[PDB]
Write a protein that binds this ligand. Structure first.
Ligand SMILES: COc1cc2nc(C)nc(N[C@H](C)c3cccc(-c4cn[nH]c4)c3)c2cc1OC
Length: 472
């Protein structure tokens, strides 16, 4: 019948793998273009290059997420296999015409070329273009993968294929070339340390406004460099994390380094009055982070203030001004009830901002851990694509804030200072944080023991210059 007529117009399974009929054993849809819930990799590749219609949502989501279920080398082999569509044999009447040296009618052959082969081949090249355009890092990390792509693209022949080959070749060239303000920004603020005097640069010697600005610029650049694929499949926690998630790992290491540096600054200031000044100055840095909508920065300070060594320092926070304590308390409350107030704040403000990154890693980990890699139907494993789409939706939220530059002048020496923070030294984190906690017990012992006094370490004025910028 008509079903067998349609299916037999496609190539048979012995000469081509991407034309088997749809069924429950190889593909599932979600409850318009159908939304793919699960399927075998061969069915996902078929639908990624589907003859009947374009599917940009699926193409975008696939090329973001595919590394969780398919290697780059393997993907290129599959789409090249997909591309190589065999043509049907001539009809009996046309076989006779070819036998006599005459031109065959080739009515069905021409229809198959028109309505199946050319569309699929164009879809394969659309995937190739999207691949090199938005995920060129695959080809940077694997030179052999690029050699295969350029050999494939370079041997494509046809009238309708010429324009696609040239645009793909043009994009590949631009990505190699790249590989090798709006308004007036405010005046760079200084306090004790002079411009160029990098030896004197420290928490209390630099201006707190300028610390916040330069950290916001640093954290903005780190935020914007993270690609969606660096988060997919929890690859930042696997053994190839350094190659797969370099920008994410850099952001995490900065957060760890800054947060522990704040803790180190506080608890290695053994004098009570000086430690109050240190804590007060870090709160001022938080207030300027808040002014700049650097929520990453705000919650880095909250993390440092809530840590085991700092949070217990009752005598230090006793002397902190009530207004600063209120600001600290409101910063904390951003995280309560699964970050409800933070998300409300994030939605309400105007750009530019730097979102809190940690929340994306939490929700991705829960999505990765909470959903199965495969769905089973009749003893066959199908790749759980809905899982990948949900992860891709979270990385989509990251990307909407990744084009918000700050109107703030970079200061190279202050940037270097914060880029090169190494509070742990040779120690590992766990042992260093144990050291931090043991320091807290020394400077402020538990209730049975009294509070000893400690000498001053700072030889310069401790009074803050404040958080309001120079506008007299
Ligand atoms: C449930 O346990 C906590 C409650 C908190 N509730 C507020 C309102 N704020 C916090 N943290 C802020 C950032 C904080 C940190 C350090 C000191 C202070 C503070 C405020 N006043 N006095 C001390 C406040 C909190 C930290 C908690 O566990 C570490």
């Amino acid at each position: 019948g008509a079903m067998a007529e349609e299916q037999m117009r496609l190539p048979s399974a012995d000469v081509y793998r991407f034309a088997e009929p749809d069924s429950e054993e190889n593909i599932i849809f979600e409850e318009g273009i159908p939304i793919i819930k699960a399927g075998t990799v061969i069915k996902l590749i078929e639908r990624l290059t589907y003859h009947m219609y374009a599917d940009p949502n699926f193409v975008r989501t696939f090329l973001t997420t595919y590394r969780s279920f398919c290697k780059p080398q393997e993907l290129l082999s599959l789409i090249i296999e997909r591309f190589e569509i065999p043509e049907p044999e001539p009809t009996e009447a046309d076989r006779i015409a070819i036998e006599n040296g005459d031109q065959p009618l080739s009515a069905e052959l021409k229809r198959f070329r028109k309505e199946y082969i050319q569309p699929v081949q164009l879809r394969v090249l659309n995937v190739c273009r999207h691949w090199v355009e938005h995920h060129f890092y695959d080809f940077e990390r694997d030179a052999y993968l690029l050699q295969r792509m350029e050999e494939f693209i370079g041997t494509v022949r046809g009238k309708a294929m010429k324009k696609w080959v040239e645009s793909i070749t043009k994009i590949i060239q631009r990505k190699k070339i790249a590989r090798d303000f709006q308004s007036s920004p405010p005046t760079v603020e200084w306090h004790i340390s002079r411009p160029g005097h990098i030896e004197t640069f420290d928490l209390l010697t630099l201006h707190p406004i300028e610390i916040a600005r330069q950290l916001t610029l640093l954290e903005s650049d780190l935020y914007r460099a993270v690609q969606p694929s660096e988060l997919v499949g929890s690859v930042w926690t696997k053994e190839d994390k350094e190659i797969n998630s370099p920008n994410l790992l850099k952001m995490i290491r900065h957060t760890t380094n800054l947060t522990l540096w704040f803790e180190k600054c506080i608890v290695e200031t053994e004098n009570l009055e000086e430690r109050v000044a240190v804590v007060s100055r870090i709160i001022e840095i938080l207030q300027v982070f808040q002014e700049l909508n650097n929520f990453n920065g705000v919650l880095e300070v909250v993390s440092a203030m809530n840590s085991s060594p700092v949070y217990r320092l009752d005598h230090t926070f006793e002397q902190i001004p009530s207004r600063q304590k209120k600001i600290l308390e409101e910063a904390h409350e951003l995280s309560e009830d699964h970050y409800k107030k933070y998300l409300a704040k994030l939605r309400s403000i105007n750009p530019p901002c730097v979102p809190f990154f940690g929340i994306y890693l939490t929700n991705i980990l829960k999505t990765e851990e909470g959903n199965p890699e495969v769905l089973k139907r009749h003893g066959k494993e199908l790749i759980n694509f809905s899982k990948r789409r949900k992860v891709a939706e979270i990385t989509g939220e990251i990307q909407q804030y990744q084009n918000q530059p700050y109107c703030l002048r970079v200061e190279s020496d202050i940037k270097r200072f914060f880029e090169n923070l190494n509070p742990m030294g040779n120690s590992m984190e766990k042992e260093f944080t144990d050291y931090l906690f043991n320091k807290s017990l020394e400077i402020e012992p538990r209730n049975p023991k009294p509070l000893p006094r400690f000498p001053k370490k700072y030889s310069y004025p401790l009074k803050s210059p404040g958080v309001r910028p120079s506008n007299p």
